[PDB]
Design a binder for this molecule. Sequence first.
Ligand SMILES: [Zn+2]
Lengths: 1119, 114, 98, 195, 49
Amino acid sequence: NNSVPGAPNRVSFAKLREPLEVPGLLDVQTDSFEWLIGSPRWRESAAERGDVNPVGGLEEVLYELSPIEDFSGSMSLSFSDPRFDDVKAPVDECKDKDMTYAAPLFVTAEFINNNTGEIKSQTVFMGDFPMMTEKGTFIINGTERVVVSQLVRSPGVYFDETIDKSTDKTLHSVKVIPSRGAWLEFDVDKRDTVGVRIDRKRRQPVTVLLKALGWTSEQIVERFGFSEIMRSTLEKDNTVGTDEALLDIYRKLRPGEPPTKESAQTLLENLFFKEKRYDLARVGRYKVNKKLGLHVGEPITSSTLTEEDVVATIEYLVRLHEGQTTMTVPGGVEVPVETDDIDHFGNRRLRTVGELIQNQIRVGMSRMERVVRERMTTQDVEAITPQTLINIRPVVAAIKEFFGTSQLSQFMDQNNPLSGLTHKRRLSALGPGGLSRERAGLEVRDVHPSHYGRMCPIETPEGPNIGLIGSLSVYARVNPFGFIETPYRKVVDGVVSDEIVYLTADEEDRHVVAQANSPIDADGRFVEPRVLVRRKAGEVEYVPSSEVDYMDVSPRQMVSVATAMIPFLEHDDANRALMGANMQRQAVPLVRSEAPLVGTGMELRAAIDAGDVVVAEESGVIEEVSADYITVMHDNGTRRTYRMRKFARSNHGTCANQCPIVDAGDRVEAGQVIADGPCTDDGEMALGKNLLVAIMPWEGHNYEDAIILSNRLVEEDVLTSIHIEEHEIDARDTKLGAEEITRDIPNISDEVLADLDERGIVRIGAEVRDGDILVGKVTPKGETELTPEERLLRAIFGEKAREVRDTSLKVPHGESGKVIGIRVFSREDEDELPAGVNELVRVYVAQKRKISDGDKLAGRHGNKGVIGKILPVEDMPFLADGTPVDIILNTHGVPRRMNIGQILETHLGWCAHSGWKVDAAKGVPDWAARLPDELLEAQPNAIVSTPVFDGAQEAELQGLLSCTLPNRDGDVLVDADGKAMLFDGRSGEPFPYPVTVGYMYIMKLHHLVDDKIHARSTGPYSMITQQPLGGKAQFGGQRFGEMECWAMQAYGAAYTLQELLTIKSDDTVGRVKVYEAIVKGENIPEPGIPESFKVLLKELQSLCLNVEVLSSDGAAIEL
Amino acid sequence: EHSRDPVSLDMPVGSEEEAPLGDFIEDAEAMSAENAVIAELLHTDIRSVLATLDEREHQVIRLRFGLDDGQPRTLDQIGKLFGLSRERVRQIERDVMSKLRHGERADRLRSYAS
Amino acid sequence: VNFFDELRIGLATAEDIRQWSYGEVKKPETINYRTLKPEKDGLFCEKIFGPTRDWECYCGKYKRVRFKGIICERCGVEVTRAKVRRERMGHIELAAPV
Amino acid sequence: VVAAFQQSGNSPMGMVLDAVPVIPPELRPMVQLDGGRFATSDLNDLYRRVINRNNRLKRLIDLGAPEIIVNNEKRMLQESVDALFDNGRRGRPVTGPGNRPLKSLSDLLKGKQGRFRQNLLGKRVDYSGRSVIVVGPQLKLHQCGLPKLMALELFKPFVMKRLVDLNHAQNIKSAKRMVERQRPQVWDVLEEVIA
Amino acid sequence: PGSLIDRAEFEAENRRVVAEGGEPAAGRPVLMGITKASLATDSWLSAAS
Ligand SMILES: [Zn+2]
């Protein structure tokens, strides 16, 4: 059932058929921007969805703004019909040339003058727009950018409830949270003062505001008569009279100002009913209407609060206080009455890239409109034209500021395709417009029963940002309003229907949802009369097979994309699965990727949708294929050429390669993978290699999570990785002169400069070591008299002063490798450089890293490790046939951590590698009844898959392990239990007891030891504090905090603590004296006073506080 | 370039407020090793090598070149001090150059010329 | 040397602020744009706080190293190490009490 | 309060100021960052405001004017000094860029970024380093393994001195150059110097 | 009255005053939290941090 034409064939232990294929894994990112700009594809998709009014993003934002006009009414402008132009340059050119992938947009502005009645309309330029590439990313200044969606609380009404500690009486609090405007808090207190808190004011009784709105007292009596507390409050208020109530409102909001009826009415209208000052997003108004069940029969057009809404809110509050289960209002249907939950996904909306960009462009457009109206109110009205009126600077400035500094525009991590795909699929919950770490409570970081199918509950950052960052489930989709929907197939009368429907949180709550694993007959009849069911909120209980209303699509509906490719996930613990999912996003693409032996079916789809594999757009026949490029002749007579980037630096230092996997004269079907990017073997994700694992403690080298590796891996380049560094220097003009890159460098030997070329740059392919010169440049010098002996040496040798200094870029500490490529941008060639620069050159250094001690390895089951030792191939334990094991894992860490899934993966991997042949002459055994007919026989080194939550049960593995094929020598190594009798590599005698063996999938994490090693004897120092400091080129000192000081004090150690804080940290002169003393034969001198105390005194004195240290005699002391 | 708002060293960098920009600014003075160790070591090696020069030649260097009293006394000035002419001193200077460039002296002084 | 029996704090009085200070700040100019060097009686003047470069004079009259503790009469600056610039103080004269 | 003031033997006049001091410039550095763009702490801006207000007060007194304007400018100088000593302790804090509050003089002591808490957080030290740890069961209890690439860069003065003394180098400069280049003659001395 | 004083200093001062005829001061032991105890017995330099 491989959807893609040329998928590799890997049988699966699938016992259920998924009625719906996984949607476009990047659909969430692309659809939002497609809606934003507005394209025919989005329009037809919306029309198919049945939306009455298909309205885009740009047109909506600049349509709600129009028609802008002056107060006098003699001027008014409008602009609409936004259309784009073609892109400037291809994505490759923009990324290579440092440009920004964009395309200009035009808007037709119709300028009209009311008095004369004339029209002036023409197209208006509105800057460039950062268009989005097909992979759902923004190319800004040549650097890949991905904007992660954000979770925010949708505007609406929330009826919170709190219980009195003393009165022990329920207190119902109502809160209205508009998108932009005043905040209302109709809260009932023990004193029964049902009031309104407009902008955090005093709790003036609600009746006063209600009558201020023109609501007659008898109307309050009749409408609220069913309410007793509210009736008493109506009878308790003292201030009466519409004018008096309005003046009281005005004084409470703006005291000390002229109190007038007209001013109060105007202020009320401006604060509540005015669209500009107070607005509710379409989603907010829709949610309010649904909650209160008013104005449901017509599309929402007015997006402002109305008196009917306020009175309905007060009625809802009083009814809920009474304990009424439901309420009805004229013109509205019956609706339930209950307190709302903030964490529910029926209340937390998702604002994708479209929403964020729309908000930013709206802010920019409003800022532009302010200036436009100000200019038009003053400029001459006769010869005015919209061209001279519209100002484009603020909008482009706002767009650029958002794309540059906004916390929701992050670098797209590019360790491997999975990491990028997950980043594009992220669900941020922090950043601008949202919660902050400190302010947010710990109750929001927990899981909610509404997360099933929308937000993966396993995948999450391990650091402090736990629970505030998730990921869309596999099947989750974002509805136009922003609420995450999930698929379901509805059961009509106990028979499952093929057709599916998408239900949001509220609809799911109001219905009954079945469980996918529930057995179903081939005719759709529930065999079990009672089936496990999910109810309103975290309630699961058996229900008759008829009351059930909805059913899931697949058991893997509640897992993210990353977590969907952990075999035997159902056996691991939640924390271990979280760790494994997070670590799957840190794998480093090796040189020769190999597809896993055991892995779920998500590998291929994730690889295809990650965008790192080139896929033929149309079916054709390949004419000629080369490493650099491939040309395919389409069936219609048109030829197309795909250019494959090779050895291109990723966003995080790794290399990206694309090797074709097709042969000349092959007919490729449309959608078939043509070449594999990093971490891909024949069009399926491959983050690591298959290693033969033996689970046992071995002489303590694998003690406490350490790992032992055979030297065969190092000498066979099994885990060899390629990393590409990047250095750059620029020649910026100075007031004292212009810097120029030249081969000649002042006072350096020719041997050191033997690698530089005439232009002054290292020649391609020249090995460069630590501290070597990479590009030679000379900077202008002013005037500085030479030191006596330096000047003399200049005179003796004929070496002139050569005032120009040396600032040549040099390879930082701890770098090496070839120089694969050099890129130079010169202002002379008409290239775009930052102001004040003329010559910018960047040199790429490529290093090939082999696995060694300290490098991190980890499987898919969240079991990290470090290479404790790399034994020679002759020392590793070897099977009975002489096959040394490639890695050893400790057995004391498996059961304690409770990730037993790794052992099952090992057993299945061995079965797949050795191949099995289930006996069938007498018939299929009992344990093989449910196995697919094609899975009873396998070839050696076959490919097998176990989909998450639906895969090989234990009985299947037990049966398979007893039917593995023999080796070429005619003997079976592993026994039925899965263990084998190993031979010791050193002693040479067999181990007393059998040991587990099998092929386990092992990745290589990016926490390599090369980057972590850090040392500093003496380097540069800071300026204000004079403490040790320096970029990681020269390395910085460690941080001797306070706990590290208590540990020292507890020892009774006093001289070490005096040193670590004075002589090697802060003393300006003590540091020099000790360095001289060590570089000389004399002893280390006595430390002085830290500069951090002299600074403290010199600052405390500046506060006009006389701080003076004194002796016993009381005499002031000098410091 | 002269019309630009300066950046306040106290604005946070990295956006987590783990440090303000003023923290990460190096100095431009003698480093703990750069000048200190080499300056003192070449001063001691001066006391060792420049002392090897003859007493009259030592004073010649001290005055014309400026070891002790600085103020490099031009051949005319040092000639006024000693009574010698501008031409005679040049031969002795070149002889001193020839003496220094050969042997342990040049070996010691190579490191301070690079 | 390092005998600090006690450390006390007090409320500074007009006289104490002046005694700590070596000079009075008369003008707000911070640096000269053309010479990139401190201005007379500014917020960075050498006359008030100290020389920018060690053993150097503002006008160069006493630029040689062998002038210790000699105030250049031409410009009235001290000839000491630049680290003194981190130590010496100044004081403003409030025209009205605050 | 009054008894605390009576026991002092000083006068309460210290509460009213007539000369505000200025911290040394190195504590508030004006530094030229790469690209020739100037950078400076807000203390300079606050001091500029105070100095300008004081000079304007002196000018008004010299010329003379009705007491209304002089009183307004006196209030101005008082508020400027107030802002200098602390921003936000009273009234609306001052903000030049992006409505960001200028770190006042007293802010160097209070808050998370203050000197007191930063000192409570310790200092950065020299002759130190960090790396991943891997279990080694071949060592005795009183032993540990240091990668040579770290020991060489951490023992640099000792090793360079001993290398000079063995006559492998003629002086300190040559020894430093050789240690940076890591010639084969350095490893023996490095093993010798960490006995 | 009502001010917490350490036992050592209070006892020494009470003995000093009583030896000259002054009447004794009546006090009772009282415990207090670690925070208040630290604040009461510490330097202002250490208290500010
Ligand atoms: Zn001078």
